[PDB]
Design a protein around this ligand. Structure first.
Ligand SMILES: *C[C@@](*)(O)[C@H](CCCNC(N)=[NH2+])NC(=O)[C@@H]1CCCN1C(=O)[C@H](N)Cc1ccccc1
Ligand SMILES: *[C@@H]1O[C@H](CO)[C@@H](O)[C@H](O)[C@H]1NC(C)=O
Lengths: 249, 28
């Protein structure tokens, strides 16, 4: 997260870290949506050009963390994966279309003051909240600058950007399965997700029922926090049917 | 279920340091 600030303790209890078992390596962000399911970006698990094509056994997740590197006694939980599910139509060769994946935990994790799931949006909630100018929140332990890494979880709030504006800001082909967010050239405010934040959640707090909903997944961008550019996110509601199918299955 | 309600914030009726920024964006 570039130009954000430290998260307060317990501020994003659905935040998940995705690690490579050996060598141990913090790979990406992810989010907890139930006691046994974690949502992330498909490119964190499958992106051949970066030599990424992981199986359940290659990975591990840590939940409840705040510090990026220090062990947090009786707070953080480690979980193994039972199965990974990547969207069947994820397009890594072209534009990361449908950059989404589910991971089933080998065992349900216990909720606590530091571990708690985020909500997935229903049609009504998506219609009301996913509108240009409305702000969402992104969190992660990714790079502090385009390139270094934070000692603790970072957070930044960003406005959803009008589709045509997103489209004219890049030559990369955008689809309905993505949305972009970020401040404009004139705005004094700045901020963006960056490398390493992929898979992390773009959440919004409903002013109707006071619950936090995950509307997006950090997916891609060109550089980080450059004026004139915007960060791109996987559109969660758009892929909600696939998500439901995997979980029901 | 209980999703989206944080134990240290909503459950204790406490506001985090920047969520007001999101609420206010629903106006402007
Ligand atoms: C995997 C994630 O850590 C990372 C997040 C980038 C978010 N950046 C900003 N400014 N919010 N994603 C990536 O690095 C993705 C993975 C593949 C390459 N990539 C990019 O963002 C490229 N810089 C652009 C791109 C290449 C191919 C297809 C789509 C976008
Ligand atoms: C990932 O590797 C597996 C196991 O070797 C192989 O079957 C699969 O084709 C690979 N994934 C892709 C699409 O590269």
């Amino acid at each position: 997260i570039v130009e954000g600030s430290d998260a307060e303790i317990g501020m994003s209890p659905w935040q998940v870290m995705l690690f490579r078992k050996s060598p141990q390596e913090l790979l990406c962000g992810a989010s907890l949506i139930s006691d046994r399911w974690v949502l992330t970006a498909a490119h964190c698990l499958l992106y051949p050009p970066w030599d990424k094509n992981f199986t359940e056994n290659d990975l591990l997740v840590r939940i409840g963390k705040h510090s990026r590197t220090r062990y947090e006694r009786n707070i953080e939980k480690i979980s193994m994966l039972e199965k990974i599910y990547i969207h069947p139509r994820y397009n890594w060769r072209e534009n990361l279309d449908r950059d989404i994946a589910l991971m089933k935990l080998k065992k349900p994790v216990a909720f606590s003051d530091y571990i708690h799931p985020v909500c997935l949006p229903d049609r009504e909630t998506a219609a009301s909240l996913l509108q240009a100018g409305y702000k969402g929140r992104v969190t992660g332990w990714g790079n502090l600058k385009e390139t270094g890494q934070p000692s603790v979880l970072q957070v930044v709030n960003l406005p959803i950007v009008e589709r045509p504006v997103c489209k004219d800001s890049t030559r990369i082909r955008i689809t309905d399965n993505m949305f972009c967010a970020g401040f404009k050239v004139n705005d004094t405010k700045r901020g963006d997700a960056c490398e390493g934040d992929s898979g992390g959640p773009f959440v919004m707090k409903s002013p109707f029922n006071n619950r936090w909903y995950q509307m997006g997944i950090v997916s891609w961008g060109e550089g980080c926090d450059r004026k004139g550019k915007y960060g791109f996110y996987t559109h969660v509601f758009r892929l909600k049917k696939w998500i439901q199918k995997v979980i029901d299955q | 279920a209980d999703c989206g309600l944080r134990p240290l914030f909503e459950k204790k009726s406490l506001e985090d340091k920047t969520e007001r920024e999101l609420l206010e964006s629903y106006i402007d």
